Specification:
Elements lengths: L16 H13 L6 H12 L4
Protein name: Protein Vpr
GO cellular component, one term: virion component
Organism: Human immunodeficiency virus type 1 group M subtype B (strain 89.6)
Length: 51
């Protein structure tokens, strides 16, 4: 074993020493292609957040 374990199919598990780094990737992903992680996320929390 020398890789991030899927665990019951493709499923998140950020705890591992592998994913300690793949977390680094994931957050990198969340600060690379992140405009609509602000804009469609808000677009969503406006549309859904009616009142």
């Amino acid at each position: 074993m020398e890789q991030a374990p899927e665990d019951q199919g493709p499923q998140r598990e950020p705890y591992n020493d592998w994913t300690l780094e793949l977390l680094e990737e994931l957050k990198n992903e969340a600060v690379r292609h992140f405009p609509r992680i602000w804009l469609h996320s808000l677009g969503q929390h406006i549309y859904e957040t009616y009142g």
